[PDB]
Every structure is written in structure tokens, then in C-alpha cells.
Amino acid sequence: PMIYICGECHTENEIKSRDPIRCRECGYRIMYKKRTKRLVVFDAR
Amino acid sequence: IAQLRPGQEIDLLMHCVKGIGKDHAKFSPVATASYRLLPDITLLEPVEGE
Amino acid sequence: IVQDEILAHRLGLIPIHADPRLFEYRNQGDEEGTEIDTLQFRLQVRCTRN
Amino acid sequence: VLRLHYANCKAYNADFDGDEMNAHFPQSELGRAEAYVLACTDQQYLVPKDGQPLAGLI
Amino acid sequence: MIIPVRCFTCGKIVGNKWEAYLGLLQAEYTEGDALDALGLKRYCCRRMLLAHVDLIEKLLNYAP
Amino acid sequence: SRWRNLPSGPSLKHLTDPSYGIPREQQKAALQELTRAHVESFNYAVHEGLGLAVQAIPPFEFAFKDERISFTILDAVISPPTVPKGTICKEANVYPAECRGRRSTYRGKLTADINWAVNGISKGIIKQFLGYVPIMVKSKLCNLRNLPPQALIEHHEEAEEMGGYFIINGIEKVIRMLIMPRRNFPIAMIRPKWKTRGPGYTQYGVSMHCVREEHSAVNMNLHYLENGTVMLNFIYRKELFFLPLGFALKALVSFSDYQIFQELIKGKEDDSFLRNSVSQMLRIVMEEGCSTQKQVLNYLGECFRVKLNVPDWYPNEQAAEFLFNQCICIHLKSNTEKFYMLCLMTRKLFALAKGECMEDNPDSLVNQEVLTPGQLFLMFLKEKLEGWLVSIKIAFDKKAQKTSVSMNTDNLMRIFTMGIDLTKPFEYLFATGNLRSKTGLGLLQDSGLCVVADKLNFIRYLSHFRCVHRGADFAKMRTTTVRRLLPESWGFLCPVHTPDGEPCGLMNHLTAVCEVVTQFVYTASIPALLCNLGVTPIDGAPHRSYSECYPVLLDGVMVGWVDKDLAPGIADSLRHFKVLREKRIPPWMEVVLIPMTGKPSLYPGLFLFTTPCRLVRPVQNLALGKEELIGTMEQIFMNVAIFEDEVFAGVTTHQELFPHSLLSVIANFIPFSDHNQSPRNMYQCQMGKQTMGFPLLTYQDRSDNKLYRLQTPQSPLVRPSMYDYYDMDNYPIGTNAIVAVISYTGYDMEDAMIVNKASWERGFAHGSVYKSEFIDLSEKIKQGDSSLVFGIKPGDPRVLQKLDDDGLPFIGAKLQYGDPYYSYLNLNTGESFVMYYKSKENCVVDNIKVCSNDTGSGKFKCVCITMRVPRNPTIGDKFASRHGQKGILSRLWPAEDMPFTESGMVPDILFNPHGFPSRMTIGMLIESMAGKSAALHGLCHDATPFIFSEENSALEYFGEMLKAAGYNFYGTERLYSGISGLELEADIFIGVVYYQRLRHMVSDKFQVRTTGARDRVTNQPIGGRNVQGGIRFGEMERDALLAHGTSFLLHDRLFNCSDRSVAHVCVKCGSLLSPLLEKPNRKYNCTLCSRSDTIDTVSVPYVFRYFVAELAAMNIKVKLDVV
RNA sequence: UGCUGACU
DNA sequence: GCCAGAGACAGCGAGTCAGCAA
DNA sequence: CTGTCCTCTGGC
């Protein structure tokens, strides 16, 4: 369930191995990975 | 703290510890604590007439 | 839009109303913390269109 | 940053406005003797051009 | 970008006077009277609000 | 106009406005007029100039078999960018937002329709696809044209952008205005290296730079020979050819030799050396064999036929016309006009030779013009189109020379055979910057033509579209005379804005009011109007003596001889037409009238330029009050007051718009530049372009290399009003700080500065860097099976929890050296490679763009990862004020050890008061008081230069402001010592000043090497910082270290640390090459003499063995005596 | 190696 | 044989950091 | 862009 948001459509595309990297509902060629809930620790200094 | 737009989310846990304002200003308890010596003003002569 | 490190900074400079005299200093390397030395707060907010 | 006294400024012409400087580390124990005796920074008090002092307060 | 939480010179907290400042300026008050009505006495605090440029409102305009 | 609605004093109530974030209805219009010369030039180059370029394009006739074929290009058309072929879906358009995400060129399609004929009765029009030409951003052939700021935000663009640049591989090349000599104007020059051109040449000559319709340029030199004769030098394809004049004059005009003579002696009809030397030009080389126009054309044709590469079936008379059309006076269509222009350039060499005229300095802007992006683009397009024709017909002639009758079947298969050319040649000129051309385009420079436009700040970016480079060759010159800042660049180039090192005086910048001309007009009714005004045509009846008459020129074409008592009135009438927009005189024609006296002043005459590349600048035309535009040469003969009360009755023909018109856009952002010394305003201009600020609003989209961002910028409380005309608060650059000018620490001396520690811990000047790395994984492989897919084989112990199943770090994860960074998977074999993170700095991944192949068919091979690196002010970082006072941060002084004031305050910057006495930056002492008064009264004062006189001082004004707030006039408040607690005896000068943070940090400039890599030719440290790399000791250091008498420190440094080997030698032969090992008791045996008892090891450098080897290479022998 | 920026 | 004509010809501060294209 | 070479060339 690796999601990628389109560049201007903003549709969640899930891509894999061996498949092209175009976007559904459009045809753009740039897609940003999505932020999942993972724990990271930062210091307030 | 922040500003959000639809679909944007913040989710975090903050831990607060004890400390003095010497190792970081965030732990300092006063805006300012300065002092000033009391001024002294003396009229050596009677000032008058505008 | 606010970064993670900048959010952590902004959160450090927020004053808490706990009185520090009822607490104690976390021992060096006490990452976990206990009722004696730490206070935990949670911010969980999401923006939606009404 | 490599911190240096201000009496040694005029000797190098350093100005603390972004002034990268190199530091070499002798490795022989026979170049250390010469860095101590000859190249030391107090044998360098007078400029060799006219013998007038080089180190001073500013 | 966003209002600093504490004034840099004296750590007075000015991060809660942004919306109040904007509201007193919409009511017709000068920046001087407005900064006075908020409790910002020393000019180190007054510069913290007087010269703030809210660029979080221009970044919060490009797509999600 | 266009400078009205300029703010009278700056304001602060625009921030804190209820409409701050609402994108506006139309773009700003003052920011738009900055890149206007870059866009309006390209708009012509690509639509109206391309037709003209292809119109010249002589039809390329050549021989096939026993046939002659003609190919002409009827039209060429460049199309906006678009998805390649239809193989893609849902949007034909292609917006510059991508090709920055992906790394690609914004390129449009160039296609022409050629027309091939066989003798002119058999013909067919084929439409070939030439190639791809890059496109500017808002250039009429781009998809972001006509978009309001709100629609420009839904495509990921700046909402305030003015493109004027190209995106070549997503890098935004910014081709900048180079300086050319002039166009269509004869410049008389005295260059002593000219007498080496031949046996009797002198150091005199008029040069002309000819440009036709912005597609062709050529340089022709008329030289004076000592005999009184004049020669003509022309260059064709980078070869210089010398033709005596007379051969040229007789060819161009079918006139008698007396009529040619009566023309070259027009103003000096009493001189007798001239009358005699004109005849020696007409008779000595032309009555020698050729006396009719055709015989001259025939002789000239035979000598030059070989190097003009003309068609073999061309008569010699036709090959002569080819030379005159393509090499001499490109600008003029007629041959009669070309004659009159060559005659005025000669009449001028005779005056320079007889010392009746002053040499024109080629380095004065009077005799200079700019080369815009459209002139370079078309002049390359035209040349490449001609080259394409030549190559297609090379292929044609070379294939078969076979019965074209049926060969009309593969004619298109033939033209396409060489139509595969025009694309990559064009990208080289843009990606690399250097020019590969058979003719250098009449340019004189072949590198640095296009440069990277970097958005470190919006003051670095805005200065790339106002830069003017004198030339890249002048960076290598003993004499410094093209670096002189002459008084003729008043209002056209900024005095202060020049790089302050190796590029000084060579890279200048335009003032704010200056502008390049880019419009093209008819200029056909002008020659007929000049005659109504009083001019008499070149044909005759001047009505005076040819010496009491001015030679009128209009864009290279000599209209001719306005009388001497009618020249002033004519110039004034023409100036009134351009000002009031009457007749059809372009609003920007330069009516120049260089008067004539008996003195050796510049050659007299009424010129009238209207060409599309001159610099102009507005000035309030007095006596009409109508905002005229004057040029660099027209400004030398007119008085232009600056302030009123400087205007007089007879004097002061014109007046300047604003008093600070002379200064650049950046130099207008420096506060109170009038009270600082000038070398400090030159450093401020160069330091405002290295500042960490707010560079842009569109992150997540740029995918640059480095991008420095300041977290919480503020707007200066004291700033010039021009800062508010071009809203520069959309992009702030620094922060206001409470500075005290006190000597308190011992760590703030000699240019170093102190920063309070609590201010630094409360967010003062925090920042970040965005490192975007484009991982295209077509590397690590060649054209085989896809070894490239980001991916993790399941369960790899190497990427247990650092990657997320697509071999890409998590968005938000922290990266450290040695951490997993990506994992490819060779699909066929089925093997993964973790590729670890090797930077020795901590960052957080903030976005990852997955990119396709431009046809939406790519296969997970290319990605772009953006890391975020927090760069807060450490010790060793460089800060600066707006007055050239740069200094490193030496301490972070505790907040309880700082000297507190009687008001409770505590400075956050400590600035040693000893930088003022020698640097004389009195503008900082005024900015402190102005900013303190602003912060106190809630105001916003302006620091515009030249607004505060001696009578109304700035210190008086701001001290009254302060004293009106309860503080003291002179700006000094008295502090206490935060260490002893006592009120210091001196009262300190404290205030609010605007600090910028510079991009140079100790974190980027620190190196330590112990042992590591080595150059393998010499076996010495490698020599870089990104690679480990050693620092070079140097010959100066080697010569200063053996003045100490320390021979063993030298031995250590140069020998035991860099290179030290044990090369062994044959002791008897004394040769290092001779000892050779054996085949395994491994005994080196000398080859030259077979003994092994003679070999002995010697400790010798490695570069010495390399030296002995490279000497042997030359047969030289180094015989060395071992002891 | 080259070339375009930049630092003292 | 006496000394102009040249016409080659060689020299042109030290160190440092990047990016980009070939 | 300068000053010596310095190797012709050329004329005398």
C-alpha cells in the first residue's frame, strides 16, 4: 500500500516494480511519496 | 503553534523536564529581572519664570 | 507546513504552569522518565472543511 | 574554529572576517624540537625586515 | 514565517498577541497605540510584532 | 510615466492588512519590467525575426548526377512545448513546473517546410521537422503566458514570476546582456597593433559592426596605409581578407572614376594629398586591368571564388555579388547605399589620419550597445538552418548521384536523413555556454554566453536580468582601462554595483530607470520627413560647400548633408516629435548632433539611431515636461539637473526623474548609502547576494541542488522607499537586532561580533538548507536488462527498518552517515544493493519525487530525494549589516553576563566600536537611531539616499525623534555591567539595526586530513574537500619555512607526509630504470649489466621517479651518484 | 581536465 | 661587416569551496 | 604588454 500523490491531480496512485510511472485520472509524470505514521524523536533545543 | 489547511494533520507527544535558564533560555522563569539605582536630582538654584 | 525541528523548537519555548518545586531532575540518560521527573502533553489536531 | 590570540594577528594579517588558516602537525620528534626552538612564536617577536617588533596589543 | 513565540532579546511571550494586534489595527488604531494596548513596553518587544512578516499565509496557498 | 505611483516614503501597514494572503488579480508590473528586455527580445526572435532569418537563407542549389536541384525554406515555425507525440494522455500542454521536478529542457518543436525543385518546373513542398529549440518561460511560445497570479499558483509557479530565463535540464540558464561595440555606426579607432596587418599599414582605422534584422552580424575594418591609400578588411568564416578600396567602390556602383572621387573629397575639396591619394586608389589598382563594373566584379570573383566556396556553375560576376551580400555592409539592401556608407567611413579615416578628429574610445558607453537573448538565439538559429541545408545536400550529393527521376520517391526519406541534426547543437550553447560556430556570429566571445541563474535570494536572482558583461576576455589583461567607470555611464550603469574581485569593472549593472530598447518599427517615412525638415538628399545641390554641412545618417543609411545653420533646428524639431509622439518618430529615436568647430573634436554630423539594442533612460524634458528618453550618446550634449533649484534658464535642457536614478536596483536597497564610504557600498551590494533569506514560496516542487532558507525573516524598520515599490517583503532577507556599540568582551575585536546566547536560543537567525539529490539509476548499468527499480528484496537484514519496501527512506526520517539510503533490485538476477548515506551531517528526508520518462512510460528508475539540514548560527558563521560590516560570530555571550540597560533591556548583538574609524560607515550609526525611533514610535522611516541635506541633517531628525520618546538626542543609553553589577562610566550607543546572515558557514569550510586517498600519478594527497583531500603547502610556504633554518620541518612536510618511496638503483650504472625483479630468492638484477650485487635501495620521492621515467621517454638519462 | 560562480 | 628591420618568444601572486557538462 | 634576446633577413 505504498501511496504516491499526483503532481496536480492529487490522486493516490500505488506503483510497483515493472510498471510505468504515470498517474491515473491524468497522465502526469511526477508523483510525490506520502508521509505515513512512523515515530520520530526531536529535541526542543 | 501552527496553521493548517484541509487534509493536514499534527500528532505528537511532548515531554517536559526540569532545568535552569542557564543551560537553555526556555527554562528561564522571568521576562526580565533587571534593577536600576535610584536617581537623585538636586536644584542648586531656584528655577523660576518660564 | 511547519517543519518537525521548527515545531519542536516552537514547542520548547511554550511556558508550562507546573510548579518546578514538586519535580526533580532527570538522571543523565534517563530517556524514559517517571512520575517523579517528567510531564507529558499531546497535541493531535486535523483540519477539515466544515 | 581554530582560536588564536590577537597579538599574533599583525604577524599573519588575519582579520576575523572569514579567514581560513592551515595547521600542520609535525610527526617526527625532530621537527618538534625545531618548532619549539626555532619556529616558536616568541622568537618571532621582531620582524626580520627592520628588526622592529611584530607582536603587540591592538 | 509564523509569529515568534518569545521575544528574542527578553523572552517575553509575544506569540499570543498576533491576532489581538491584527484585531486592534482593523479597529482604527495606530501601530503605536496598538502595541501599547498589548503591553509591549520596551522597544525590543515592539519590533517583534511591528516588523513581523506573516509568510505562513502565503505558503498555505499552494496545493496540499 | 512607468515611474509614477512610486512610494513617497515606505509604509508598514501592508503587512497586517486583512488581504495579505489573497493572491492578487494581476501581477506586480514593476517586477515585470525587470526581465522585460529578456522576454521582448525572444518574442521577436521566435515569431517576427524567424521569418526574416529564413527569408535570407539563399536557396541551396547543388549538382545531383547531371542535374541541378534547388532547396528553399519558405517558413519555419516554433511551437509551444507539448507532450511528445500523442503517446501521452489528458493534457497536451507542458508547464515549466515540471522539468524542474523532472530534470528536463522546456523545448518547443521547430519545423520548416522546404521546397525542392529540379530546374524550377518540377517542385514539391515537403514539411520537415527540424528539431527542438528551448523556450523562455513567459515568452509567447510558453504555456504560462496570459495567466493571472491566482491561476499561476495552481500550476506550481511563483505568482510573482517574470521568467526571462531558459530551463536547460532544470537549471534556469539566464543568458545575460553582453556588450557589443555598436551597430551600423562607424567608430574611428587608433589601435597600434594594426600596422602589423601588412607592409605599410598605419595605426588608424574605422571599424563598423553591421547587423541585418538581428539575424546577421559582420565586422568590416577600413585601414589607412601610409601611401594615403585605404584598405578594407572583411572576415568570412573566421579568415581575414584584404581588398583595396576602389576594387570595392567600382564593383558596388556603375559610376565614373571622377564621380566616385568627387564623393570621397566631399568636405576637403582643397586638400591635395587627399585628392592625389584618392586617384592612386582608383587608378593604381583598378586601371590596372578592370575599368567596367563587370570586369571588376569578374576579377574580384576569380580571386575570392576558392575561399567563398561558391557553386562551380556560377559566373565569376555572380560569385562577387555573393561576397558583397554576405561580407560587407550586411545592413544595407542597395549597393548604391553600401557605396555611400563605405565613402563616409573613408571620409572619416582621412580626418582621423590628418588629426582633424578624435579617436572614439571603444570603452565608452557612447560607442557601445548590448547583445540581448533574442539576437543570440536567432543568429544561432539562422546559422544552424543554413548548416542543416548544407548537411542534407551533402548526404544528397554523396548517396548515389542516380537518376533523380524515380528518386523523387525517396526525397523525403532523403531530407529526413539529415533532419536528425538541429536538436543537440542548440542545447550545447545553452547547457555549456560556449559557442561552436563556423562564423563567431560577429561576437568576439565564444564562452560564458549563458550562465546559471541561482535563486539563493531574490536579490541574487533579480541581478542576473540587469547584469551587463563588458566581455569574458577582458578578465585576462595587464592594463586596467576597461575598469574605469567613466562619467558617460551616468544613469545607465550603477557606480556601486560591480563585483569586487577579479570581475571588478567588467560586470556592471543597469540603473533602475535604465532600459534596453527592443521594439522594431517601420522607419520608412523618416527619410522623407528629414527632407521636409531641411536635409538635402545624398544626390546633390547641398546649397553650401560640403564643409559647412553636417552629414546626416539614419541607421547606417546616409540621408545626407543637412545645412550647418539648419542642423540645430532640425535636431530640436525631431526631439519635439519623439517627446510628443508626433509623426512616426519612435518614442526612443536618438537625435544626436555632434557639433563641428575647428578643434579636433569627435567627427561632426547629425546621427539618428532607432535600432533595437541601445540603452535608454527617462529624463523629465524641461520646456515640455513630457518625460523624454535619452541614450548613452545623446546624453553627452545636454545638461540634466538632478535637484530643482539646480535648473537654470539657458542651461539645464533636461532634468532627471528622481535624485537616486543613478543607482542600481540593489544599490537602492542599502539604507543611507550617502553617509558610508564607497568601497563599503560595493561590498554591501556583493553581500546582499550571498545572504541566507527567503528564496521562494514553492518548496516541494523545485528540486534544486542547495537552497538556503531563513526561518523567521523580518522587514527592516528603516528601509528605502524603493524597497516598497518592488515588494521585497514577499521575500525578506534578515532580522532586526538590538545592537550596542560597546567594547565589553575581548572576543569582539578585529571584525568579530558577539551574539547573546538567549537570543540565539529563542530563535534568532535560525535557518536550514535543502539538499535535493536526483538519483537517476540508468547509471550503474548500460543498455542491458533493467538493473534499475527502487526496491527491497523481502527481509534484507541491511534495510530491516530504514527503508519502506520501495528502497526509499521514509518521508520525515532522519539520515546519518552509514544509514541505508536506497535499494535497487536487478530485476533479472534478483539482487539488491543498499547504497548507504555517506554525508557526515544529519538531515531529515522531507520529500521524494518519483519521475517518469516524458512519455509517461518510465519504469521506477529516476527519483529526487530532498534532505533538510538545520543550519543554526554557530561560532564561525558570517553575519553582516546593510553597510558592508561583515564579521564572524566569535562568542555566544550568556544572557546574564550581557550589559543590561536602565530600561531592563539587554542587547543581542555586540559590535566593537573600532570598525567605524577606518571604514567610515556613518550609515550604521544613523540606521541604529532610525530603527530605534521606529520601534519606539511604531513608525517606518525611509533611508533613501540624498533625502537629508546639510541643513536638514539625519542625526538632527532622528535625535529629535528619540528625544520625543523620552530617550536622549545622541542615541546613547547608559548600561550596567552584567558581570560586576556597576553602572559603566561611559554611556553606550544602542539601537536597532537589520542584520543579514551570510551563506558561508564553518560547517562548509573546515577540513582535517590524516591519511587517505592519493593521486596515482604522483602518489600524493588528492586535493579536495568533498574528497578527503590534502591542503597544499606551496612554494611561498616552502621558502618561508627554510628562512627559519628548520630543514627538518621542511623534510617532514614535503617528504615524509606527501610522497616518500624506496626506489632502488644500480650503484655502478647509477640508473633508476635499470634494476628489474625476477621470476619466483627474489633478487633485483640490473638489466644493462647482469650483476645483482650492485643494486641498492635509495629513499627518494615518488614524483622524482615519475620525472626520471618521463625523461627516459625523451631519451634523456638521469645518472645519479649513490653514496 | 575544462568552464561558470564565489571566499581571504 | 654595422647595426637597424624586424619576427618569434617567454613571463605574467597565493591558497580555498562548489556546480555542471563533456 | 613589455624588455631582453636571438635568429634570421636584408641591405650595404
Ligand SMILES: Nc1ccn([C@@H]2O[C@H](COP(=O)(O)CP(=O)(O)OP(=O)(O)O)[C@@H](O)[C@H]2O)c(=O)n1
Ligand atoms: N585577492 C586577494 C584578496 C585578499 N587577499 C589577502 O587578504 C587580505 C585581506 O584582504 P582585504 O581585501 O580584506 C584588505 P583589508 O585591509 O583587510 O580590508 P579593510 O580595509 O576592509 O580592513 C589581503 O591583505 C591579502 O593578504 C589576497 O591574498 N588576495
Ligand SMILES: [Mg+2]
Ligand atoms: Mg579578512
Ligand SMILES: [Zn+2]
Ligand atoms: Zn493525477
Ligand SMILES: [Zn+2]
Ligand atoms: Zn522583549
Ligand SMILES: [Zn+2]
Ligand atoms: Zn648495472
